[PDB]
């Protein structure tokens, strides 16, 4: 049926979503999972939201990513309006009009990370690693745990993803190209890619490797 999580709300606001859920027999939970059908975001007047994990796992799963205005309006009009009509256009980083969630809902047959082996390497922040990994699998990539366990051959295309911020070492991520043969890039490659639901030419994200 319908199962919701919310992102960016206040308790007051959450309470309104709850009232909504009660009226319409919609399930409402704290954590996002496979079953989650909807992701309710705090947006501005033009449905521009912030980027949060739920936001990403939302698009990645092709869930409904809908502005909080879906709720209040539905309450205000004593009935449940169309998700179609309140969907989030974009975000405060990737643009007000990119229609990410849209694409997704209609691309579950060709996922942006078809034929990719991704290895999320090293420490991350604000986002547990297994979640970033879950993210990329939802997009069709294949997760790999250790640099040395990329699937050699040609069949596939490997990629190492790092978040430089969270490192406590001097010269050590400039030198991944020593222990494997994959392009290296920042998390922003994935997040950006998932936001837009477009595969971002590695170009802008590559990290330079000590020969």
């Amino acid at each position: 049926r319908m199962s919701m999580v919310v992102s960016g709300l206040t308790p007051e606001e959450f309470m309104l979503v709850y009232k909504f859920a009660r009226k319409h027999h919609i399930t409402l939970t704290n954590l996002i999972t496979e079953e989650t059908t909807h992701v309710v975001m705090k947006t501005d007047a033009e449905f521009v939201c912030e980027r949060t994990l739920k936001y990403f796992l939302g698009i990645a799963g092709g869930k409904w990513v809908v502005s909080y205005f879906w709720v209040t309006q539905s309450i205000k009009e004593r009935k449940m309006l169309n998700e179609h009509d309140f969907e989030v256009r974009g975000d405060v980083v990737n643009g007000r009009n990119h229609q990410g969630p849209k694409r997704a809902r209609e691309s579950q047959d060709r996922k942006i990370f078809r034929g990719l082996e991704i290895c999320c390497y090293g420490p991350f922040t604000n986002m547990p690693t297994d979640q970033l990994e879950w993210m990329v699998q939802l997009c069709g990539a294949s997760v790999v745990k250790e640099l040395s366990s990329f699937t050699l051959g040609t069949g596939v295309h490997p990629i190492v993803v790092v978040q430089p911020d969270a490192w406590t070492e001097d010269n050590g991520f400039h030198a991944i190209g020593q222990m494997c043969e994959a392009p290296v890039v920042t998390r922003e490659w994935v997040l950006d890619s998932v936001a837009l639901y477009q595969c971002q030419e590695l170009d802008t994200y590559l990290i330079p490797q000590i020969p």
Binding site: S7, G8, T52, L53, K54, V93, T125, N126, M127, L191
Partner: peptide, 4 residues
């Protein structure tokens, strides 16, 4: 939630 953290934002990015």
């Amino acid at each position: 939630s953290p934002t990015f």
